[PDB]
Amino acid sequence: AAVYNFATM
Amino acid sequence: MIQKTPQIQVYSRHPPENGKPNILNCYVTQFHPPHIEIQMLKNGKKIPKVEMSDMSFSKDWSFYILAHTEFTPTETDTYACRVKHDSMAEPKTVYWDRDM
Amino acid sequence: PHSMRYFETAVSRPGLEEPRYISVGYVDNKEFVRFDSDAENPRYEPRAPWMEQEGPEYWERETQKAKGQEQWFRVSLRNLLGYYNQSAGGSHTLQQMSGCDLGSDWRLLRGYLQFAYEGRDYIALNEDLKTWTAADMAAQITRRKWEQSGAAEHYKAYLEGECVEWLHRYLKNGNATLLRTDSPKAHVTHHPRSKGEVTLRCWALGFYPADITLTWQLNGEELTQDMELVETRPAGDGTFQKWASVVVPLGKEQNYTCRVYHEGLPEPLTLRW
Numbered sequence: 338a339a340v341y342n343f344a345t346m
Numbered sequence: 347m348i349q350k351t352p353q354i355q356v357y358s359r360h361p362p363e364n365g366k367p368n369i370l371n372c373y374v375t376q377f378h379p380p381h382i383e384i385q386m387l388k389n390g391k392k393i394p395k396v397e398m399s400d401m402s403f404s405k406d407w408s409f410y411i412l413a414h415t416e417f418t419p420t421e422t423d424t425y426a427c428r429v430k431h432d433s434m435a436e437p438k439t440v441y442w443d444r445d446m
Numbered sequence: 447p448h449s450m451r452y453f454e455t456a457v458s459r460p461g462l463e464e465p466r467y468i469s470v471g472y473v474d475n476k477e478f479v480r481f482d483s484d485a486e487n488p489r490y491e492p493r494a495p496w497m498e499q500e501g502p503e504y505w506e507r508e509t510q511k512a513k514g515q516e517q518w519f520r521v522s523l524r525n526l527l528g529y530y531n532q533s534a535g536g537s538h539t540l541q542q543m544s545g546c547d548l549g550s551d552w553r554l555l556r557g558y559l560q561f562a563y564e565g566r567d568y569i570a571l572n573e574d575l576k577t578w579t580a581a582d583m584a585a586q587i588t589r590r591k592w593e594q595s596g597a598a599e600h601y602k603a604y605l606e607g608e609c610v611e612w613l614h615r616y617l618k619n620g621n622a623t624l625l626r627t628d629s630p631k632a633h634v635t636h637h638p639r640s641k642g643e644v645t646l647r648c649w650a651l652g653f654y655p656a657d658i659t660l661t662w663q664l665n666g667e668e669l670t671q672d673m674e675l676v677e678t679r680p681a682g683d684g685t686f687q688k689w690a691s692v693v694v695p696l697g698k699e700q701n702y703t704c705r706v707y708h709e710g711l712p713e714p715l716t717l718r719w
Contacts, residue, residue, distance in 0.1 A: 338508065338608050338609070338611075338612040339452050339469065339471065339479075339490075339508055339511045339512070339515070340452055340511075340544045340559070340601065340604050340605075340609075341511045341514060341515070341604070342514075342515060342518045342542075342601075343592075343595065343597040343600045343601065344591055344592050344595040344597045345518060345521045345522045345525060346522035346525050346526060346540075346561075346568075346569075346588045346591075347564065348538070348539055348564040348565050350565065353677070355676065355677065355679055357679060357687070359681045359682050359683065361633075361649070361651075369682060371679075371680075371681075371682055373679050373680065375677075378539065378564075378565040379457065379537060379539050379564075379565070380455065380457060380539065381457070381459070381537060399682075400470075400480065400482070401455075401468065402453065402470055402477070403453060403455065403541065405543070407541055407562045407565045407566075408565065412680055412682060414682050445635065445637050445647065446647075446676070446689075
C-alpha cells in the first residue's frame with residue numbers, strides 16, 4: 338500500500 | 347546541474363558462441379537526470395528495435411536502466427553501446443568484448 | 447529483516463507535456479507494483495506473481511493514490527522552481543522514498559520518508575517520525591510549512607500502521623516466492639592476456655538474488671592482489687551475473703582455484719581451469 342502525501346512542498 | 351557520470355557495461359546474456367542466437371545488453375547506471383539516450387551499434391551501424399527496461403533508481407537517487415537487443419555473434423562483427431547523457435560533454439561509446 | 451519501499455519520481459521536460467510520474471513498489475528489495483503516467487492507461491500493475499491474488503478494488507484504490515500523488519508532485523515541482531528561482535525552459539527531477547523495515551519478528555524497526563530535488567537530498571523525516579531534516583535554504587521553507595500543518599504525524603501514521611499492516615499481508619502471500627533462490631552456475635575462462643602470463647576469469651551466471659562473492663586462491667592465500675572484479679550485472683531474465691579474474695603465469699593456470707559463495711548453493715562452488 339502506497340503512501341499518500343499531505344502538505345505539498 | 348543534476349549530473350553524475352554513468353557507468354556502462356556491455357555483455358551477452360549467455361556465454362557467446364559464433365552463429366548462435368544470444369542477447370546483447372547495455373547496462374547503464376549511476377546517471378541523473380533520468381533522461382538518457384542509448385544506442386546499440388553493430389559495426390558502427392545503429393541497431394533497430396533496441397528494447398529498454400523500465401526505469402528504476404537506487405538508494406543514492408541515481409538511476410539505472412538495461413537496454414538490450416537480440417543478436418547473433420560472429421567472428422568479425424563488432425557491437426557496442428553509445429550513450430549520451432547531460433553529465434558527459436560528449437557521448438561515450440563502449441565496445442563489447444566477448445571475454446567480459 | 448523484511449521491508450517495504452515506494453520509489454517515486456516525477457520529471458519535468460520542456461514542451462507541452464505535463465511531467466511524467468513514475469512509482470515503483472518493493473517488498474524485500476523485489477519490485478511488485480509499478481505505476482507510470484506515460485502508460486496508455488495509467489494504473490498500478492502487478493510486478494510479481496503473488497500480487498495477482500489482489501482484487502480490483504485494491505488496484506483501483508492504489509491507482510487513486512497514484513493519481514493523487516501525480517498532482518502532488520506536479521504541484522510540488524512548481525513550488526520548487528519558485529524556491530530556487532529557476533527558469534521554465536529546462537527539466538527538473540523530484541524523487542521520493544518512503545517505507546518501513548520489519549525485523550524477522552515482524553516488529554517495526556524504522557520508518558522512512560525522504561525526498562530529493564535534482565538528485566540531491568532535499569527534506570527527510572527523522573527516525574523519531576516527528577522532526578524534519580532540511581538540506582538547504584529551500585528545504586527550510588518546506589520544513590516550516592510541514593511543521594505548521596503537522597505533516598509528520600500523518601506520514602508517521604502510514605509508516606507505523608498501513609506500511610506494517612499491508613507489508614505483513616504481502617509477505618504472507620509471497621514468502622514462498624521471495625524465499626525462492628537460483629544457484630549460480632560457474633566456469634573458468636582462459637585468455638591470452640600476455641606472454642609468459644595469462645588471464646583466468648571465473649564466471650558466475652544465472653543466480654538469484656544478486657548477492658554473491660567470488661574469490662581466487664593459489665591453494666591457500668586468497669588473491670586480492672591483481673584481481674579484477676565487475677559490478678554484479680543483470681542478465682535481463684531476472685537472474686544476475688558476475689566474474690572475477692587474476693593474472694596468472696602461463697602454464698601455471700590449473701593451480702589457481704575459484705570459489706563461489708551464494709545463498710542458494712548446498713555449499714560454495716569450487717572450480718578451476
